[PDB]
Amino acid sequence: KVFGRCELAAAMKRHGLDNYRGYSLGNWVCAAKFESNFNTQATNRNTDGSTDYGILQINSRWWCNDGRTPGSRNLCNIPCSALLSSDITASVNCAKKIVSDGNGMNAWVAWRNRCKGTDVQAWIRGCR
Ligand SMILES: [Cl-]
Ligand SMILES: [Cl-]
Ligand SMILES: [Cl-]
Ligand SMILES: [Cl-]
Ligand SMILES: [Cl-]
Ligand SMILES: [Cl-]
Ligand SMILES: [Cl-]
Ligand SMILES: [Cl-]
Ligand SMILES: [Cl-]
Ligand SMILES: [Cl-]
Ligand SMILES: [Cl-]
Ligand SMILES: [Cl-]
Ligand SMILES: [Cl-]
Ligand SMILES: [Cl-]
Ligand SMILES: [Eu+2]
Ligand SMILES: [Eu+2]
Ligand code: NA
């Protein structure tokens, strides 16, 4: 599923991402934009051979099992394929663990590089 901007914002908010670990809603929407362009079906290989899955591009090196990432952990106890669902419940639940891991949203390199320090509130501009 490709989410609308305000649609995804509404969904993330309902799942409790709004100011989760102090990260306001726009931070989360902004991250999704540059990780997946709002597409729950997005997958991308990383150089280390792990794969990123879903709206928030959650890595198979640590967070989910895809069965082809050697020496990896499945810390959200979930098959990676479940992060591609049009229901973002699993991604959001997993993202809460990731963001709580110590470095906050810096875990998403694209967030640090493209969202951090910017006017992220614009990402929820006009949404109810
Ligand atoms: Cl957009
Ligand atoms: Cl990740
Ligand atoms: Cl694996
Ligand atoms: Cl393969
Ligand atoms: Cl290896
Ligand atoms: Cl594990
Ligand atoms: Cl599995
Ligand atoms: Cl949803
Ligand atoms: Cl933090
Ligand atoms: Cl990670
Ligand atoms: Cl990441
Ligand atoms: Cl800005
Ligand atoms: Cl801006
Ligand atoms: Cl915001
Ligand atoms: Eu990646
Ligand atoms: Eu760690
Ligand atoms: Na894994």
UniProtKB/Swiss-Prot annotation:
> Which residues are annotated as active site?
E35, D52
Q: Spell out the protein name for this chain.
A: Lysozyme C
Location of the protein in the cell: Secreted
Major subcellular site: secreted
CDD domains xref list: LYZ_C
GO MF terms on file?
beta-N-acetylglucosaminidase activity; identical protein binding; lysozyme activity
Q: Where is the C-type lysozyme domain?
A: 1-128
The catalysed reaction is:
Hydrolysis of (1->4)-beta-linkages between N-acetylmuramic acid and N-acetyl-D-glucosamine residues in a peptidoglycan and between N-acetyl-D-glucosamine residues in chitodextrins
Q: Which residues bind substrate?
A: D101
Q: Which family does it belong to?
A: Belongs to the glycosyl hydrolase 22 family.
- Record Gene3D superfamilies: 1.10.530.10
What GO CC annotations are associated with the protein?
Answer: cytoplasm; endoplasmic reticulum; extracellular space
Could you tell me the gene encoding this protein? LYZ
Q: Subunit structure, per the record?
A: Monomer.
Query: What role does it play?
Result: Lysozymes have primarily a bacteriolytic function; those in tissues and body fluids are associated with the monocyte-macrophage system and enhance the activity of immunoagents. Has bacteriolytic activity against M.luteus.
Biological process (GO) annotations held by this record are:
cell wall macromolecule catabolic process; defense response to bacterium; defense response to Gram-negative bacterium; defense response to Gram-positive bacterium; killing of cells of another organism
Superkingdom is: Eukaryota
Query: Entry's SUPFAM superfamilies?
Result: Lysozyme-like
Cystine pairs annotated here are C6-C127, C30-C115, C64-C80, C76-C94
